[PDB]
């Protein structure tokens, strides 16, 4: 996260760290949506152009974390993956359209002050909150800049949703309805963006109707980090909720 700040303890209890077993390293962010299901970006698990195709046994999920590199004894919980489900129409060949994946844990994780699931939006909450200008929150242990370097603890930044035409005119990549972009415009002064290592993490919004946090997006892609005139792109969670429901219902 660039231009963000240290998260408070228990501020994002649904935050999940996708951890590579060997070598032990941070791969991506993710989110807890139930005691046995974790949501992340498909590109975090599958991306043929870079010879990336992880299997269940190559990864681990660390939940309830704050510190990036330390083993948080008596606080974080480490879970093994039972099965990975990537959207069947995830477009890794072109623009990362439908960049979403689900991971089922081998065993249910125990909720605590530091571990708690986030809500997935309904059509009405999505329609009401997904508006240009409305701000969401992005969290992660990704790099602090495109080029300090890495954060000691979880970072957080609030960013405004951007108008679709502006999103489209900011890049040469083909934008689809399954994506939305966020970030400040050059003339807005304020800055902030996700960066390397934050992918797969959540873009959440707190509903002013019921005071619950909803995950509206998944950190998907960007060209550089916090560059003027550029914006981060996020997977539109509600647009792909039918797929999420289908997977969970069947498995």
């Amino acid at each position: 996260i660039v231009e963000g700040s240290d998260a408070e303890i228990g501020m994002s209890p649904w935050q999940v760290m996708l951890f590579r077993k060997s070598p032990q390293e941070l791969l991506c962010g993710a989110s807890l949506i139930s005691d046995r299901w974790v949501l992340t970006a498909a590109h975090c698990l599958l991306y043929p152009p870079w010879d990336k195709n992880f299997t269940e046994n190559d990864l681990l999920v660390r939940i309830g974390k704050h510190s990036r590199t330390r083993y948080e004894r008596n606080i974080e919980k480490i879970s093994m993956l039972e099965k990975i489900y990537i959207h069947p129409r995830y477009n890794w060949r072109e623009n990362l359209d439908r960049d979403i994946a689900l991971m089922k844990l081998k065993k249910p994780v125990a909720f605590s002050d530091y571990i708690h699931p986030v809500c997935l939006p309904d059509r009405e909450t999505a329609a009401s909150l997904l508006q240009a200008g409305y701000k969401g929150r992005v969290t992660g242990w990704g790099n602090l800049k495109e080029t300090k370097g890495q954060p000691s603890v979880l970072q957080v930044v609030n960013l405004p949703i951007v108008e679709r035409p502006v999103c489209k005119d900011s890049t040469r990549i083909r934008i689809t309805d399954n994506m939305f972009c966020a970030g400040y415009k050059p003339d807005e002064g304020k800055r902030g963006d996700a960066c390397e290592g934050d992918s797969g993490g959540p873009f959440v919004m707190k509903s002013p109707f019921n005071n619950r946090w909803y995950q509206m997006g998944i950190v998907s892609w960007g060209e550089g980090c916090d560059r003027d005139g550029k914006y981060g792109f996020y997977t539109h969670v509600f647009r792909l909720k039918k797929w999420i429901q289908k997977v969970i219902d069947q498995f």
């Binding site: 060997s22 032990q24 390293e25 941070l26 681990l60 590199t69 330390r70 083993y71 480490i78 093994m80």
Partner: peptide
């Protein structure tokens, strides 16, 4: 060596 070793119960 950037990350602290995790107990082997997970590695």
């Amino acid at each position: 060596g950037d990350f602290e070793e995790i107990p082997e119960e997970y590695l």
